[PDB]
Design a protein around this ligand. Sequence first.
Ligand SMILES: C[C@H]1O[C@@H](n2cnc3c(N)ncnc32)[C@H](O)[C@@H]1O
Ligand code: SF4
Lengths: 539, 527
Amino acid sequence: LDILHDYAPELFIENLEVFINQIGRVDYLNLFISCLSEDDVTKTKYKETLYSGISKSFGMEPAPLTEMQIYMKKKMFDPKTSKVNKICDAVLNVLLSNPEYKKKYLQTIITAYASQNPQNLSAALKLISELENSEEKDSCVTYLCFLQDVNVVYKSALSLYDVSLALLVAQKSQMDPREYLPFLQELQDNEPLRRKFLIDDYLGNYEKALEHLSEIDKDGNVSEEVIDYVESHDLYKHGLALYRYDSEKQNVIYNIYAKHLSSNQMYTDAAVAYEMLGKLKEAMGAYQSAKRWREAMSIAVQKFPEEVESVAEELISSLTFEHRYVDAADIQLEYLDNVKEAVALYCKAYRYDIASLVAIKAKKDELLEEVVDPGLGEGFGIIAELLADCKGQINSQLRRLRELRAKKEENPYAFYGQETEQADDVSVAPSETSTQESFFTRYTGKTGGTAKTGASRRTAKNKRREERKRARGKKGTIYEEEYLVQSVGRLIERLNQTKPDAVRVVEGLCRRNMREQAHQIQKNFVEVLDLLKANVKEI
Amino acid sequence: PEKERFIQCCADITLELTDSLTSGTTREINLNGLITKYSKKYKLKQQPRLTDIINSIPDQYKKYLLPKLKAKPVRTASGIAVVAVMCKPHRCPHIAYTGNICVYCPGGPDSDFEYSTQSYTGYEPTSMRAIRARYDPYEQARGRVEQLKQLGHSIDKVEYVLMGGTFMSLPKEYREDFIVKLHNALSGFNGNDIDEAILYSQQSLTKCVGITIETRPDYCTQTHLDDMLKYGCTRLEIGVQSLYEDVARDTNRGHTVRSVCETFAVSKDAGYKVVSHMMPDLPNVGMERDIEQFKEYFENPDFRTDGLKIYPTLVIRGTGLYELWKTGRYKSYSANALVDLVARILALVPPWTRIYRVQRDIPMPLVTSGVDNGNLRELALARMKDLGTTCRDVRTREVGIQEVHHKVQPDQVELIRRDYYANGGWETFLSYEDPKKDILIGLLRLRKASKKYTYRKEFTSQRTSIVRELHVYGHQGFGTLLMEEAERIAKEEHGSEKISVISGVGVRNYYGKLGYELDGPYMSKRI
RNA sequence: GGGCACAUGGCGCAGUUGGUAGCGCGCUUCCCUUGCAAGGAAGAGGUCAUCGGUUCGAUUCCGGUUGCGUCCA
Ligand SMILES: C[C@H]1O[C@@H](n2cnc3c(N)ncnc32)[C@H](O)[C@@H]1O
Ligand code: SF4
């Protein structure tokens, strides 16, 4: 059947009216606008062999198209390009236009609306109810329930904002009438907006429910059902997408959203929302829990001249715990007013130049002998310590990465990788667990006897009894060797973190006129970073 | 306790499944596991079945949720539930005018069995159902249909079989009573008059889509055929057992092959459909003649019947064959030899002939010598595959068994039409089939009423084509297509002014919507 | 109340670090309730009650949780 279009689609589409006039029976038209399969039969298969050469392979066996394909074809399907939608829309245009066709060929239009993959049932039920009859309309409802699933069509009837049609359909759904008759009665004996809210609730259309419940009252005083609903469902985004008009009620939504965000996860949202409501103490709490010292303390000094320093104590505690000694020193010197502690944090954050600034500011050059010189000495100590420790770690890493040593070959050699030792192909079952395991595989194992996905590309892990092996196929502690870079990065992260710190500290200590140890540790650091086997052969 | 927790477990299973299925949701763990997790708290042997849970669903929910477990067309969709009954034991007619009974029929009224009808051994399930009903048709029919209902089938087209001896050799009052009782147990009407019973059964729910009456060639005269068409019979089953007259003579058969052929012609011209019995390994035959007769059966355009029943000769104690097998005068075939013979026979079955059955289901512990196993067709098809050739039987190409055994679906339906000459008549055989995979989707026989043999007052008055059989198994507007093409054939190809279909009394209303008017026992339509 | 042998297809069982998929019934399917048997054939029902480290190997090793006999003071 479908052929009749797929053969000469241009001429067909041109003369669809002639075709409809030709097809006398409504039944043929109906059951032609239902079997429209989205596949062609003239350029994908069933080739017309009139013109093909007689010596050509006329036809091979079509493939079964193993199940998995359909999965990323239905989800890849584009409901804007399919032939089904095109023919359905053409038919709709040629049928809705003429009053006589609507009078007679209604079931064709219903079939068309139910056949297009977007499933335009809204228009179908709308036109069905639009009929001014009680005989044909019920027949068409029965026809639709035979065609389309009764549950989805009943839900669409509800979404169409009608109960009489809903009750008519619900007599074809086999649900116990005790389970829907009270519902339909309650929907029937309420106001249009209450009924619409309940309708949008039953289908679960929460956004529609709220955007139709908000309009029930024209008063500037917001309702409390709306806030209860949004609190129960967490849809404040629509609250502020709907009430961009009413500032006061929008601020009410701001308040409830700020409460929600402060509770669940995140804090600067709560503070910036309290910015409108004020909510002074709550705003302060959100700001300081957000580690945003400057904004909160500005609010304090501009509002509360009594708790200015207590919040400073809380912020300095946070920054000491945050280990952000820069802003810690800043709030210590400017607000806590302690130059010595500020410089101590400066040395903690590897800062000396501004530490010298602060020591000069208090007219106190003793601070150098107090903290600054001791701080630089401690910096020299810690850089030496990290130097030795990282040197040992590098030695250990290189020793593990001594050579291929064969051992593992069954994995594609990108599993080894490790400074492009060898390339690879696809992947095999993930083997070589922590520190060079073997692959005897005489049996299938305790957790074995099934297929293995073959996933030894570079590394992998499985959930079978939840790993239970510290080596989660990852390049970290007790690493299994064989890592394509990403073990240099374990060192690159650290040396790049320390390098600005290294040059800063050595330059600061040089400024203090002990440049001997400064240049010693600088040269040792550059040597230890250079001699590292960065990637393959230091290239 | 022991079993109460089982009943309440089934109850909660039913209620929960109904609640889940009201909104359109399936189960998860094949309820028997969920059944046990609650009912086997002490593991006291409580073993439910699918029938057990089905007999728990409430009526309103049962009638609507039951078919949502079965999907094979002929099983629950086509719903031709073969419901076999039996008549009272009696002695087959020929014994009187020959001297003794057929030499191979086991059991009967004067064998070692006192209870089984003729040609039966009182151990087949049908026999125990008949005896537990005391051979009464009403109990037989009600019990069988109720057992079918209990087992979860949604049966709607009961097709009756009247097995056992020659049913046509009984006093007419008894047969009238039997048929009226069958139709009454079907419809629910409680009358006694055959005309009224038919008229009531025609409107009845659970339609009597036909009835088969196995008989003998001699007892199928014009008057007997009129009788059986009065009853509502639609398919005949005729004993033949051999085309060689010598074998029939030596078996005390009592009817010549020429009589069989004449009966075939007149019955097929009466609108019936005939299924014949074909016994291999008859005495004095041998493999050469076995193959010869089975090859001629479809080659002689005189028999060529629409159905068939291959019943390899089984010797059982007490028959006339035990006093001939014991002396060693007759030795059976070999297991491999007979399997091969069945393979070669089935290789020759034309596409229209349907193989209704193979070797009898008489129990192994009772057969003295014959077929060893009980799955002869399985081995026959395996050997067919081994030889390369394949079967064309209708039953081996219909959709229903394929969807559950072969698990192959049809996608290349096409119209095919055979046109052969059998029993002096021109028989067309329309079908919608699958040429690539040899799968038969729908079929319809058709016959040009031959002037030589037709006799019905409905047919001799004006030229007539008879739609002897229409069958659709696996949108689905096929009966319509076949019926329209048959109309076209009978109008142009046949030149027949009135085309009439023989129909079981149950289905006479279906042809009503097709424009047919009821003439006598046929659903006719002028052209 | 804690030590504690065990806890494993529906069920009683073979769960095993030299080393994990099945026994007996039970259920589903076809052959066949003489077109659908509660026989025979053929299958579905599971990687252990969770996790941590090592072994070609991991409730199987050790460790603790909920019950199943059972105490003990
Ligand atoms: C019922 C059908 O089986 C035939 N028949 C008679 N006796 C036997 C037997 N022992 N085994 C098989 N079929 C038999 C009848 O003659 C008829 O053809
Ligand atoms: S051969 Fe025919 S007539 Fe004789 S007993 Fe068997 S069925 Fe009856």
